[PDB]
Structure formats: C-alpha cells, structure tokens
Amino acid sequence: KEYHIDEEVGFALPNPQENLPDFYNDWMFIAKHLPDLIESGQLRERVEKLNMLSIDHLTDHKSQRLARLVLGCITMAYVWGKGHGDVRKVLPRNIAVPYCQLSKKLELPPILVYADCVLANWKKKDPNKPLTYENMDVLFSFRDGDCSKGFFLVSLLVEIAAASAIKVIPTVFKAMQMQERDTLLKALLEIASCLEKALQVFHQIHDHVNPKAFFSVLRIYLSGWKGNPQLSDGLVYEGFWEDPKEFAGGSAGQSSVFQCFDVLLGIQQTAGGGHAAQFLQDMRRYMPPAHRNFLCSLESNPSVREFVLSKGDAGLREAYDACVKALVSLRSYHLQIVTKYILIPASQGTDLMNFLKTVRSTTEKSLLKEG
Amino acid sequence: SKEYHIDEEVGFALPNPQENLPDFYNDWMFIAKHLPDLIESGQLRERVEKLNMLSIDHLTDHKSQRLARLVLGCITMAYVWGKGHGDVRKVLPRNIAVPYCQLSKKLELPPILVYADCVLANWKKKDPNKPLTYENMDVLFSFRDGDCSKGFFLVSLLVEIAAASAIKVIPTVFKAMQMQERDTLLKALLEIASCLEKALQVFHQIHDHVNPKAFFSVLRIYLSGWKGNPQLSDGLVYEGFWEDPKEFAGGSAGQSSVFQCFDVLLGIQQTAGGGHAAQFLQDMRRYMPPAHRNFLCSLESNPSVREFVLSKGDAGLREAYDACVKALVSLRSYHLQIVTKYILIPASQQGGTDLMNFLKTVRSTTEKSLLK
Ligand code: HEM
Ligand code: HEM
Ligand SMILES: Nc1ccc(Cl)cc1-c1cn[nH]n1
Ligand SMILES: Nc1ccc(Cl)cc1-c1cn[nH]n1
Ligand SMILES: Nc1ccc(Cl)cc1-c1cn[nH]n1
Ligand SMILES: Nc1ccc(Cl)cc1-c1cn[nH]n1
C-alpha cells in the first residue's frame, strides 16, 4: 500500500532531489556552505539578508522535501551558531514564514527531523552502482569534520537493510488470515534475517563516526528547543506565530522502521503512560504523515504474537522469537554505541540510559522462550 | 465501514448494552448499583475494602467485559473521591484494583472511568418498542442523588448518535472521490452537514436535564482523574498491580472517536502542532476502545477530501464542504456557551481562563479550514 514505502529503500525517499529551482538559489547557497558561513561568522548575517521567498514554486513532493531539508539545516545553524552557547531565540521572518508554510503543507513540525537529515539527505556517487557507503554522499552538513556523512549514511544503510523486511509484512497478515502455516513461518524467519543483517550494517558506524566529533559538534546542531534550558520558552517563528513554540530535536525514534517491528510483534512500546511510551508516541508526530499511517494501521491488524501463542507450534514460536531476539541484539548493540559516543565523552544525563534499557527490557520480556 | 464496531443505527455507541453481570459478580454489582446511598451514608469505602478479590475469567463476551469496566470504574471513582468533599483515597484496594487493571489490559483501555464506559455502555431503553429518545431512556449507573448524571450522560449519547448517522456516509465520500463522481460527493457532503446540524439541535436539550451547580459541584468531581491533579500529584496506586502510582486523565468527550472523526475526515489538523489542544486530543485517543482509534487511523490513511475539493474549481463542492466545517464551528461555539454556564459562572460562586482559550484554539482551527 502507498504509505510512501519504497520496496528497495523503505521509508527513505528514493533518490532525493539535489537542486531546487533557480528561484531558491539564496536558500541553496546558505545550505550548501553552512560549514564555511558558520566558520567565518557570516551565516546569521546571510540569513537576515534573505528576502521572503514563496514556497509556491516548490511543485512536486521531492522538491518540497529538499526545501524542508535546506530550511531545516539553515534554521539549526542560525539558532545554534558556532555551537558554544551563542544562541538566537527568534527565527527571522523571511525564513521562519516559508519554513512554517512548507512544514504545515507536509504535516511536519518546523524543525529539522530524522526524515529530513537522513531519509532526504543522500545521493549516489555513481547512479549505476549499488547503495553502499562508498557510493554515497550526504547533501548537507553543519561543520567540517562533524561526521554528519558517517552518522546520517550509516543510519540510512541500517534503515534500508531493515526495509527489505517490510515488504514481507503483508505476507504475515495474509498468512494469518488464510491460515497458511508454512507461509507464515517463512515470512518470520525472513524478517529476522533482515533485522540480523541490519545489525551487521550497524557495525560500520565505528569506521565513519568519531566520538569527539559527534558529542561536541554534531549533537549540538541536532538539538531542539523543547525542555532545553538554552531556549527555555522555545523558538519564536517570527511572522508565523506570536509566541515561541517548543519542538523536540532529531532522534531515530522519528524513524518508523524502528517502531514498526515492535508493533508488528506485539511488543507494547507505546502502551501505558510511562516516559518511554510517551516519548515514542510523541516522536510519531515527527514522522511524515504516510509513516504515521503505516504505524497505526499495523496496530489495527490482528496480533502476530497472539496468533503464534495459540498454535502449539515450536517452529512458529522459534521464528517469532528469532525476530524478537534480533531487536534485542540491535538495542543491546545500540547501548554499546551510546556508551561510546555519549557516555564516555560526557566524562571528559542517565535518563537516557534508563530509557534505552526500558525499551530493551520491554523487548526481551516479549520473548516466548529463552530465559 | 469495516469491523470498527460501527453500529449503523447508534454509531459508536454500544448497541443495547448488558445490564446484569454473572451472579459470580453480585458483590461488585450491589456496590455499583447503590453508590448514591452507600456514599452518602458513609458505607462505601468500608464495603470496597472488605471485598473479596474476584476473578475476570468468568466474563466471556465483549458486552460483559464492558459492563464490568463500567462497574469497577464507577466504584473506583466513588472510592477515590468519597463524598466528593476533598477527602481523597490515594490507594485503590488490591481486591478491586487488580481485577480492574487486568480487565483494563484485556480491553486495551486505561484503568480509569472513560467516555466509552459511562456514556457508550451506560444506557438502556425503557420500552424496547419505542425509539431512542431521552424520555424513553435511562442510564445504568449514577454517583449521587441529584448529580444530573442521567441528563449529562444521555444528552452526550444522543448527540453522538445523531452525529454517527453521518458515519455511514463516509464510505460514499471516498468512493465518490475515487470514481470521480462529483454529484455523489456533493450529495454525501451535504448529508454529513445535515447530521452535524441535527446533532447541534439535540445538544440543545442539555439545559433541560443538567443544572449548573449540580454539575459543577457534584458530577464534575466524580469524573475527575489523577493526571496533573493536585489532589493526587503522583496519581493513584493500583495496589498489587503496579508498585508505583500511575497518572491517568479524567473522562472526556474527546475520548469519543465520533467527536474527532469529522476533523480527520475534513482535514482539520487538530492534533497537528505542539500546542496544548493538539496534545490533549492525541492523548485522549489512547483512552478510546481499540476499534475506535483504528477507525480514526483508517480515516487518516485516506486521500484528503479537502485537497480533492480545493482542486476542482467547483463552487458547489466547496460550499458543501464549508457546510460541514460550519456545522463543526457551530457545535463548538454553542459548546463554549455551555462551558460558560456550567463551569465558569458556577466557579465564580465558590485561573481557568486557559480553559476557554483551549476550546477557542480548537474552534479557531475549525474556522480556519473554511474554503471561502
Ligand atoms: C553516535 C551514535 C548514536 C547515539 C549517540 C545515539 C543516541 C541515542 C539516544 C541518546 C537515544 C535515547 C532517546 C533520545 O534521548 O533521543 C537513542 C534512541 C534510539 N536510537 Fe540512537 N544513537 C546513535 C545511533 C543510532 C543509530 C545509527 C540508529 C539506527 C540506525 C539508532 C536508533 C535508535 C532508536 C530506534 C532509538 C529509539 C529507542 C529504541 O527504539 O530502541 N541509534 N539513541
Ligand atoms: C455541562 C456541560 C459540559 C461542560 C461543562 C463541558 C466542558 C468541557 C471542557 C472543560 C472541555 C475541555 C477539555 C477538558 O478539560 O476536558 C471540553 C471539551 C470537549 N467537549 Fe465538553 N462539556 C460539556 C458538555 C459537552 C457535551 C454534551 C458534549 C457532546 C458532544 C461535549 C463535547 C466536547 C468535546 C468533543 C470536547 C473536545 C474539544 C473539541 O473537540 O472541541 N461537551 N468540554
Ligand atoms: N541516526 C540518527 C540520524 C539523524 C538524527 Cl536527527 C538522529 C539520529 C539518532 C539515532 N539515535 N538517536 N538519534
Ligand atoms: N529499534 C530498532 C528497530 C529496528 C532496527 Cl533495524 C533498529 C532498531 C534500533 C537501533 N538502535 N536501537 N534500536
Ligand atoms: N459529554 C461527556 C460525557 C462523559 C464524560 Cl466522562 C465527559 C464528557 C465531556 C463533555 N465535555 N468534555 N467531556
Ligand atoms: N468536536 C465535535 C465533533 C462532532 C460533534 Cl457532533 C460535536 C463536537 C463537539 C461538541 N462540543 N465540542 N465539540
């Protein structure tokens, strides 16, 4: 179904647009040269000299997504500046207005989001070679040596690997309805295979992302203004709203591949009123609309977990457990990554580690056997 | 409409709910059916505390699990709030806390009284051979004598039913857009506007059967929850189920999918943005039966009726669309007048000006969707 889920790249926007119309060259210059303009203290001056351009000449969807990315990166650069506390609390009206206009048109909040800086922020080097890190580049970066190419592209390659399991999801629910046991068993093993491949793709992050680079540079420009003391009241989108609005910074929780497998397998991540559930439910507000619809429509289907629990079928239970264990392997490896890239650099705060352990614990206790 | 538990006659209301539980649950039912006297005489909390822990497994069909949730939910409200004078109980006894919490998880609902409980599953006909009018209806449970719970619960129900007759027209709208049937779509939109206009007239009856001071001082107290409530800043302890207390919001008509589905269908992005109103309405979807929030999800997964109408240069289609938007504005404007009379004026005779601004942002979002 057309939930904007390509069968090759999944939730990624397939072959994103690299260039806006010439009408938007003033946007594209500031975005193309964010590291240079920030380095010379010229960025904020160039943003404030902008005319208010109409979003009307952004016709197709892909050009609209590129413009959201361009404006999202400029906004983060304008707000955070050089990244050392010199912050602006008011977004100039000539960029705040078209940004908020395009954001509402695409049902996304006016802040840089995972679907912007990952799913719409890549290109093939050679269009006839496959989707490998060596054949890929990002379209925009914040500062030189911020390892944004490593962080964005590795996340994208993990997402693409997991995406090949999504084309199998309708086979699951059809087989449950048709009571096709062998079909369902094959589908589950195939999903666990793709999730286990995504873990191997995840290993690449040590080669392309440096802990100091991420923690002190890249993490700053991805921060938001919701519960942030630096902007305690939010950001004023001058010309579009009178009062400052709070919005959360980017997070892979805004990726719908990384929530749908919990939904598919009956792992109740968003159930209840806890903080982990509320966070994962909130980050859904930051996904493209087609991605929100894919999640809640999965929750409308009969439970895969209930079906397998009722069949007395060891093969079926082992295949279901294979998928759940792959999620556990992913989130356990993820806690290793967070230790290396946030915990040990902040030693030279742990609500974070409690949240990640809560989400993993919920996944592990969904296992049918083990223990 | 799919198996989203849509009755075509009463909509999202539960068709003729069950009145009596298995005799295995007479201890629950005697308490719930006698809350007015048990509370006023001061027997209630003691009787709740001396209850035996009953099991849930003897509640088979959906209609009975729902009747039990309504039973335990009212008992919970009565125990927590007592005589409604500020004496609050912050621990729910395990013998009632854990059957409630179990049955709540089985129904994918939070363990607190909800709109689907005290409205959609809290009614009966007097004469089964007569229509669904107020005179021929009654509720199954109340809190206190003179709390006006019959008028409040039933008028809300009759409005939902009047609006729900438009739901059977929703499939016609999306098929008309897909088949490119301009005349069918225009007829369907006008029909939807008709049901919302009729629902506003049903709304008028609220003044006949609900009294301001009785609602503000009595009924509103028992419907209150424990989420951001200073009287239970940390929530309620469901003894023997969760070690820690849990916060859960009070009952609200925003917990009915009928009252949010027309914003969805028309493209009023009420849950969009980060404001208080958008966050409240999205959170209240977790307090809906799963079939109801599946239905809302299904509507959101359809092509935009608003984008379709805007792209056709058809003044007839735009005016039919605007008629549906106007009816929602009318309902919410009349609703603001109700809140003034039933909350604001009584409260000034014992701040909550954020309350009117909250409702006004929702009405304003509706007005801003008019095409011309
Ligand atoms: C330098 C590397 C990374 C760091 C420092 C990091 C940091 C974090 C943190 C702190 C959280 C907790 C929620 C929050 O506060 O935002 C989180 C959650 C999450 N992260 Fe990352 N992350 C990294 C890499 C990745 C990658 C590459 C992916 C996927 C390709 C990923 C997937 C997720 C997901 C899905 C969540 C939501 C929790 C869950 O579903 O388990 N992380 N991450
Ligand atoms: C004495 C009568 C009433 C009072 C005092 C009242 C009060 C309120 C209040 C205070 C809110 C704000 C949300 C909250 O704080 O919970 C609200 C919202 C709402 N009310 Fe009621 N209400 C009354 C009757 C009704 C009835 C009969 C309906 C039947 C449909 C209704 C439908 C709604 C809806 C749908 C909302 C959500 C906001 C929106 O969608 O615009 N109200 N009401
Ligand atoms: N991989 C990511 C890519 C982009 C953005 Cl904005 C966030 C993340 C992320 C991963 N884990 N937490 N956030
Ligand atoms: N929750 C996830 C679901 C799917 C995939 Cl492929 C990865 C993750 C993940 C990665 N890091 N933390 N969680
Ligand atoms: N009509 C209602 C019926 C029942 C309950 Cl629990 C709440 C409401 C309501 C009205 N306005 N906001 N909520
Ligand atoms: N949002 C609504 C949607 C449908 C109907 Cl029938 C009524 C309302 C309503 C009533 N009062 N406030 N909102």
Side-chain angles (χ1 to χ4, degrees):
Chain A
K1 296 123 264 262
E2 282 313 312
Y3 291 102
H4 296 167
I5 320 182
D6 193 284
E7 70 95 46
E8 165 162 15
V9 306
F11 281 147
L13 183 74
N15 270 279
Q17 197 163 112
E18 300 193 29
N19 300 286
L20 287 184
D22 297 86
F23 182 85
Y24 300 99
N25 280 349
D26 287 359
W27 292 359
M28 192 61 55
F29 168 77
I30 299 183
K32 273 188 202 158
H33 290 279
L34 281 187
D36 307 322
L37 287 172
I38 298 173
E39 199 40 73
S40 62
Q42 293 261 46
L43 165 95
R44 293 176 165 163
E45 201 261 316
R46 303 315 298 160
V47 176
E48 296 155 0
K49 200 183 166 182
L50 279 164
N51 298 321
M52 176 179 295
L53 317 187
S54 176
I55 77 174
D56 287 2
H57 303 67
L58 304 163
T59 57
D60 63 315
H61 178 72
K62 264 167 50 200
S63 61
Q64 294 169 23
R65 288 286 296 279
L66 173 59
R68 240 198 77 86
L69 172 60
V70 165
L71 299 180
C73 294
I74 297 163
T75 299
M76 301 304 238
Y78 185 95
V79 166
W80 300 121
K82 280 170 175 280
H84 306 114
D86 199 332
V87 184
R88 301 301 151 89
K89 319 202 176 188
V90 184
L91 193 61
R93 90 190 306 105
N94 282 353
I95 194 148
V97 166
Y99 191 26
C100 291
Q101 297 183 343
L102 192 67
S103 296
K104 188 217 243 188
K105 190 183 206 290
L106 291 166
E107 304 191 42
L108 289 173
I111 192 178
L112 189 68
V113 98
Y114 177 93
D116 300 317
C117 60
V118 175
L119 303 181
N121 191 22
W122 61 272
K123 62 184 284 187
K124 269 182 180 183
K125 286 178 174 177
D126 182 6
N128 281 316
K129 295 217 213 168
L131 298 165
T132 50
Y133 187 96
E134 293 65 43
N135 190 35
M136 293 170 89
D137 250 308
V138 299
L139 305 181
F140 304 103
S141 300
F142 291 111
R143 303 277 244 114
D144 284 321
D146 64 358
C147 289
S148 50
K149 170 175 176 168
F151 188 63
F152 294 154
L153 288 191
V154 166
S155 305
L156 172 66
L157 292 165
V158 163
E159 173 135 348
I160 293 175
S164 63
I166 289 167
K167 50 187 190 173
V168 163
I169 289 185
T171 301
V172 177
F173 294 116
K174 193 192 191 76
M176 291 171 60
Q177 184 189 51
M178 305 310 237
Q179 283 238 240
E180 289 281 336
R181 182 265 185 186
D182 298 333
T183 299
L184 171 67
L185 178 72
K186 189 206 183 190
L188 291 181
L189 289 175
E190 172 62 22
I191 286 174
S193 177
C194 298
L195 293 178
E196 213 69 60
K197 299 193 201 92
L199 175 59
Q200 297 307 316
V201 172
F202 202 173
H203 291 354
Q204 300 183 51
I205 194 175
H206 301 273
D207 312 339
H208 311 297
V209 185
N210 159 255
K212 161 85 177 183
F214 173 87
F215 184 78
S216 61
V217 182
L218 186 57
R219 195 181 107 262
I220 300 309
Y221 290 91
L222 300 183
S223 293
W225 32 95
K226 178 162 185 291
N228 193 339
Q230 294 178 271
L231 302 184
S232 56
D233 318 298
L235 175 75
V236 178
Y237 296 85
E238 166 185 291
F240 199 85
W241 295 310
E242 167 175 311
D243 298 81
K245 304 304 170 50
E246 282 187 305
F247 288 112
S251 158
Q254 306 165 340
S255 172
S256 172
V257 289
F258 303 148
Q259 297 204 23
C260 75
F261 295 105
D262 297 297
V263 173
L264 171 67
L265 302 172
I267 313 177
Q268 308 279 76
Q269 296 288 5
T270 52
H275 281 150
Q278 191 56 49
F279 177 78
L280 290 174
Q281 186 63 228
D282 286 329
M283 294 300 101
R284 300 192 176 189
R285 305 314 119 206
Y286 294 68
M287 314 178 180
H291 295 189
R292 298 188 294 259
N293 303 335
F294 174 72
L295 284 189
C296 66
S297 79
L298 280 188
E299 321 192 272
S300 94
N301 277 292
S303 172
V304 177
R305 170 181 191 81
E306 278 178 8
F307 183 97
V308 175
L309 271 174
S310 68
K311 284 300 181 290
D313 189 325
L316 263 183
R317 280 182 276 111
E318 196 180 44
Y320 172 87
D321 268 4
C323 301
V324 175
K325 282 146 82 74
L327 290 183
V328 173
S329 293
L330 280 157
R331 296 189 161 107
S332 291
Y333 188 87
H334 172 262
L335 280 154
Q336 295 178 34
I337 289 302
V338 171
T339 285
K340 176 188 167 171
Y341 286 89
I342 280 187
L343 288 198
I344 80 167
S347 63
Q348 302 148 355
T350 43
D351 304 349
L352 176 152
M353 290 297 281
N354 284 21
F355 164 81
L356 296 176
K357 284 167 148 136
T358 300
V359 175
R360 174 179 71 171
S361 165
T362 294
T363 306
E364 197 269 350
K365 309 297 175 290
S366 290
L367 273 178
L368 291 190
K369 40 156 306 192
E370 259 296 336
Chain B
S1 289
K2 209 216 205 71
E3 289 85 2
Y4 293 132
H5 292 25
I6 313 201
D7 179 295
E8 56 93 38
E9 178 217 6
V10 291
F12 276 153
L14 173 77
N16 273 257
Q18 195 180 330
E19 316 193 29
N20 301 287
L21 275 187
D23 303 344
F24 181 80
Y25 300 103
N26 278 17
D27 282 336
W28 294 357
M29 189 66 48
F30 175 85
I31 293 179
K33 277 281 178 180
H34 289 97
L35 299 191
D37 184 82
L38 284 190
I39 292 175
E40 180 151 299
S41 70
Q43 290 182 61
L44 187 121
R45 300 197 160 128
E46 259 213 272
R47 261 186 138 98
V48 176
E49 287 152 341
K50 290 190 182 59
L51 259 165
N52 293 319
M53 174 172 309
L54 302 186
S55 173
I56 305 303
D57 307 358
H58 302 4
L59 303 148
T60 47
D61 49 355
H62 185 73
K63 303 144 293 300
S64 299
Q65 307 161 276
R66 294 280 308 278
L67 174 60
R69 254 198 59 101
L70 173 62
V71 161
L72 310 174
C74 300
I75 296 178
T76 309
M77 294 309 207
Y79 186 88
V80 166
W81 303 118
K83 301 190 190 183
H85 302 135
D87 191 292
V88 163
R89 296 313 192 78
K90 311 180 176 164
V91 180
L92 196 56
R94 53 155 36 82
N95 277 17
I96 188 135
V98 312
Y100 194 27
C101 279
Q102 288 161 351
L103 171 71
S104 291
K105 184 179 181 180
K106 192 184 199 293
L107 294 175
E108 300 194 54
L109 284 175
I112 188 171
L113 192 68
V114 95
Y115 180 93
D117 298 324
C118 61
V119 168
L120 300 186
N122 190 30
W123 61 275
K124 66 171 285 186
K125 271 176 170 187
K126 295 171 170 181
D127 187 347
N129 299 311
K130 279 168 186 56
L132 287 149
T133 71
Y134 188 77
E135 305 76 35
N136 192 47
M137 287 180 77
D138 215 303
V139 299
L140 305 185
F141 300 112
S142 299
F143 289 111
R144 315 280 270 95
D145 285 10
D147 65 357
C148 293
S149 62
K150 193 205 184 193
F152 186 65
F153 291 154
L154 290 190
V155 166
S156 288
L157 176 64
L158 301 167
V159 171
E160 168 138 350
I161 290 175
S165 49
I167 288 174
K168 56 178 165 264
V169 177
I170 299 180
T172 299
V173 167
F174 293 125
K175 187 175 192 157
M177 299 165 53
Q178 157 183 82
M179 304 306 301
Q180 206 93 17
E181 289 286 326
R182 181 264 185 194
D183 298 321
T184 304
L185 173 61
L186 164 47
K187 184 193 177 194
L189 292 171
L190 291 177
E191 170 62 20
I192 289 170
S194 184
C195 301
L196 296 176
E197 289 158 350
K198 296 177 185 176
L200 173 62
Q201 290 305 307
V202 176
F203 204 171
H204 289 353
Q205 310 173 21
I206 182 89
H207 297 285
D208 301 331
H209 317 306
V210 185
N211 161 255
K213 286 184 281 259
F215 167 85
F216 178 81
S217 66
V218 182
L219 182 56
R220 178 188 61 110
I221 300 291
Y222 288 99
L223 305 173
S224 303
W226 30 94
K227 171 145 182 180
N229 193 344
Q231 300 182 284
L232 300 86
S233 59
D234 296 313
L236 179 73
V237 179
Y238 297 88
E239 169 170 272
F241 198 88
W242 297 292
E243 189 176 308
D244 309 72
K246 298 305 173 218
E247 271 187 319
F248 286 124
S252 160
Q255 303 170 334
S256 178
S257 42
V258 166
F259 300 139
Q260 294 195 27
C261 79
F262 297 102
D263 294 298
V264 175
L265 167 74
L266 294 180
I268 338 281
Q269 288 154 27
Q270 295 288 358
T271 45
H276 281 269
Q279 191 69 38
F280 175 81
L281 288 170
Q282 176 69 51
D283 293 334
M284 289 304 103
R285 295 188 178 183
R286 283 281 166 244
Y287 295 72
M288 301 178 175
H292 291 176
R293 86 180 83 99
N294 292 347
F295 168 75
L296 290 179
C297 169
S298 178
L299 289 177
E300 259 153 354
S301 300
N302 279 269
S304 177
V305 180
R306 170 187 181 82
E307 284 313 301
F308 188 95
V309 173
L310 265 176
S311 74
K312 287 299 173 278
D314 190 327
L317 280 181
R318 288 197 313 267
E319 283 150 22
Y321 174 91
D322 275 357
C324 296
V325 181
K326 290 167 184 294
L328 289 180
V329 173
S330 298
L331 280 155
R332 296 194 158 106
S333 285
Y334 189 84
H335 177 267
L336 277 167
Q337 300 178 7
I338 294 303
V339 169
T340 289
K341 164 174 172 164
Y342 284 91
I343 282 188
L344 281 190
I345 289 179
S348 73
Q349 305 175 300
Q350 278 178 296
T353 288
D354 321 321
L355 169 58
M356 304 301 280
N357 293 332
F358 165 90
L359 295 175
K360 279 168 191 178
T361 59
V362 179
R363 174 176 73 170
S364 167
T365 298
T366 318
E367 274 162 352
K368 285 167 169 167
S369 298
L370 292 167
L371 296 189
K372 304 257 163 165

